Amino acid sequence: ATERTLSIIKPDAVAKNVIGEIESRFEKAGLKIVAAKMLQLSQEQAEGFYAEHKERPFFGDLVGFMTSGPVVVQVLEGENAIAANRDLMGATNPKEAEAGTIRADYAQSIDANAVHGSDSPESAAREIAYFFEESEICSR
Amino acid sequence: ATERTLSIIKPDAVAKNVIGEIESRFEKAGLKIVAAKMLQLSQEQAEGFYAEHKERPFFGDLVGFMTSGPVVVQVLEGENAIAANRDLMGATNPKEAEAGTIRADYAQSIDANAVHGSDSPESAAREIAYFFEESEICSR
């Protein structure tokens, strides 16, 4: 079925100026960029996004790294979008990630992985609504 | 010098999902994407941006085309950016320009010509401000 998932191009990939190359991974795979914006996350913003990881000892690394630069936050829409996004991203850890995936090709570490993606249809709905309202989303 | 210029990925380009490919033409030429947002242009927005042709007989079609679907309005930064972006885009009419320009490779008609770019430093600065406050622009 056609789903919506949240994608984020992280500061490390943005700084590498490979935004184009990454968006092409999604588009060539049949995913449509349906909402997008570049911004500099504030600490309060990043924290609210990673709300579910509030108490964990790595929270400061997440939030830390995710505010280290401007990011592109965006909605990808298409057939089996959430899971396809995960397939294209590779595993969370670049060392573990299958070659040909984004994290394998572009990431250096777990903090500095090249991208983010919603891991469930539950996280999809929440993560999208957090950054975007429906008017900003342009399905096609 | 390092300058900023407004770039637009038009509804035809977005519709064919070549956002990544077009972005990679800019990034591989040394430009940086320092502001970006996807939106459906309102008729008021489209008429304001193109107010110059507001009395010409093609105005309705230009506004029509530019509101016919969602776009990516963005700011590109780098040495010679404004002129640099003009070279990459090519010539307004796809028939004229050739050999791996955006317009030649991705656009068919002058009406549906893939991308916009600011043509002069005086328009560049004003076009950027039409779409983006300075805070939205994340220089690197």
TrEMBL record, chains A, B:
What's this chain's function?
Major role in the synthesis of nucleoside triphosphates other than ATP. The ATP gamma phosphate is transferred to the NDP beta phosphate via a ping-pong mechanism, using a phosphorylated active-site intermediate.
Q: Which cofactor does it need?
A: Mg(2+)
What EC numbers are recorded for this enzyme?
2.7.4.6
Family, per entry: Belongs to the NDK family.
Record's keyword terms, sorted: ATP-binding, Cytoplasm, Kinase, Magnesium, Metal-binding, Nucleotide metabolism, Nucleotide-binding, Phosphoprotein, Transferase
Q: Where is the Nucleoside diphosphate kinase-like domain?
A: 2-139
Enumerate the residues binding ATP: K10, F58, R86, T92, R103, N113
What NCBIfam families does the record tag this protein with?
A: PRK00668.1
Q: Which InterPro entries match?
A: NDK-like_dom, NDK-like_dom_sf, Nucleoside_diP_kinase, Nucleoside_diP_kinase_AS
**Name listed for the protein in its UniProt record:** Nucleoside diphosphate kinase
Q: How does this polypeptide assemble, per the annotation?
A: Homotetramer.
Q: Which reaction does it catalyse?
A: a ribonucleoside 5'-diphosphate + ATP = a ribonucleoside 5'-triphosphate + ADP; a 2'-deoxyribonucleoside 5'-diphosphate + ATP = a 2'-deoxyribonucleoside 5'-triphosphate + ADP
Please give the superkingdom of this protein's source: Bacteria
What SUPFAM superfamilies does this protein's entry cite? Nucleoside diphosphate kinase, NDK
The subcellular localization recorded is: Cytoplasm
Origin species, per record, is Halomonas sp. #593
Give the CC-aspect GO terms: cytoplasm
